[PDB]
């Protein structure tokens, strides 16, 4: 019974994400002409988000049919592309915030460093770094049987798994969250040093950080609880958690693009 609801959730979130990202990519590519620097990062993040949602139906079928019939050669590349995208999204967000910092804090001296050539060059670096980081995820991908009598594929085969989880937790939260928050704090300090803009900017930073934390924390909490310590309730909770993991990709383009002023006018052209 709950499986039907889970599948409906997967389909709904996939449809919403694909529609939003397709709209953003089409509008950006058609009329924007990519004149400014910001459009490069927006385009990169939108493409990564669009490619992330490709693998959702496969996992939906895997959780629905309580078995994997596609084969062995398919889910290897499935987890490969998932590992690529899951990290490139976060790295792009971090680098965009880093770029946002310098422009406001150091107006004059940052002009030499910010050129379209460097922005074009930096795009491939995140993809390369993500691939190098996730190299070991696809070298030990295999299959395993289940209680019901079906085989599902999983990740690299005592405390090695705990070390892997700790490594992923560090590389996923320790670096990004602090470097996102410190830059916005310094932005607040600088803008206040020089009476309604403060309210708007504080609301923006608060909502962004809250959304990120709410989307990402429970997944790692549940994984840590499982690794530290057999009912269908646990399976349902884990399925809902991995469903909730995907909301950030759906919600990001609306929050960074539609609310921006210098995006509506061109959207009014077409």
């Amino acid at each position: 019974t709950s499986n039907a609801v889970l599948t409906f959730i997967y389909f709904v979130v996939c449809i919403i994400g694909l529609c939003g990202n397709t709209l953003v990519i089409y509008v950006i590519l058609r009329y924007a002409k990519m004149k400014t620097i910001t459009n490069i990062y927006i385009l990169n993040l939108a493409i990564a988000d669009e490619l992330f949602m490709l693998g959702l139906p496969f996992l939906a079928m895997q959780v629905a049919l309580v078995h994997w019939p596609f084969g062995k050669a398919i889910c290897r590349v499935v987890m490969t592309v998932d590992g690529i995208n899951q990290f490139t999204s976060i790295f792009c967000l971090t680098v965009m915030s880093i770029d946002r910092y310098l422009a406001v804090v150091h107006p004059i001296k940052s002009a030499k460093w910010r050129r379209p050539r460097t922005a074009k060059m930096i795009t491939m670096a995140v993809w390369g770094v993500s691939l190098l980081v996730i190299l070991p995820i696809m070298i030990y991908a295999g299959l395993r049987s289940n209680q019901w009598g079906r085989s599902s594929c999983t990740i690299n085969w005592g405390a090695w798994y705990t070390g892997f989880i700790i490594y992923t937790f560090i590389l996923g939260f320790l670096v990004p969250l602090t470097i996102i928050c410190l830059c916005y704090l310094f932005i607040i300090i600088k803008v206040k040093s020089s009476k309604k803009s403060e309210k708007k900017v504080t609301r923006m930073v608060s909502i962004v950080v809250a959304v990120f934390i709410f989307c990402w924390l429970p997944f790692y909490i549940f994984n840590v609880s499982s690794v530290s310590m057999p009912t269908p309730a646990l399976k349902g909770m884990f399925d809902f958690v991995v469903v909730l993991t995907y909301a950030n990709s759906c919600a990001n383009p609306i929050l960074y693009a539609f609310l921006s002023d210098n995006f509506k006018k061109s959207f009014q052209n077409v």
Binding site: Q62, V63, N146
Partner: peptide, 8 residues
């Protein structure tokens, strides 16, 4: 229990 993106 469960691991990665699926359960046993």
């Amino acid at each position: 229990x469960c691991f990665x993106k699926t359960c046993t």
